Amino acid sequence: SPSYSPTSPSYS
Amino acid sequence: SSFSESALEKKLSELSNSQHSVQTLSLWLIHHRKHAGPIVSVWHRELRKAKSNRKLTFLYLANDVIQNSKRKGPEFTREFESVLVDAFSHVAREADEGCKKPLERLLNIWQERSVYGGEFIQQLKLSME
Question: Where is the CID domain (chain B)?
């Protein structure tokens, strides 16, 4: 594979 | 690797847009967060030297590092703040120019082959600026 997604980190 | 500016430069040269590439380098940078100042400085210098099509990926790395660093400390959030305005300005201009390149190449072909006259080619060029 997937391209990076910037929502992927778990930080809320 | 141990942290060094040379090791970071080599890792940044290989940074791709895959989730895995961004995540792996982000994890290494967080593991060496004591060197946040040098990390951010090298990041910023390499962003500017990078090919326009790799520049967004640098901002993705920043995203990953900054977000994932929150649970450890405010060092990266603070260090990045000094460079992110320049980074965004730079990537905005470059990604714009980069995305227009195929259009410019087409106009250059049109000029070389006299598909239209120079005056009209200049009008087309101006319409993209």
Answer: 1-129
Determine the structural domain holding residue B26 and report its residue range.
1-129
Decide if A11 and B21 are in contact by the 8 Å CB cutoff. no
Give resolution in angstroms.
1.9
> What technique was this entry resolved by?
X-ray
CATH number at residue B65: 1.25.40.90
CB atoms near residue B38 (< 10 Å): 15
Is there a contact between A9 and B21 if contact means CB atoms under 8 Å apart? no
Q: Residue A5's closest chain B neighbor by CA?
A: B19
Residues B96 and B15: their CA atoms lie apart, in Å, by 21
Q: Residue B63 and residue A5: Cβ atoms within 8 Å? A: no
Residues 6+ apart with CB under 8 A from B103: B128
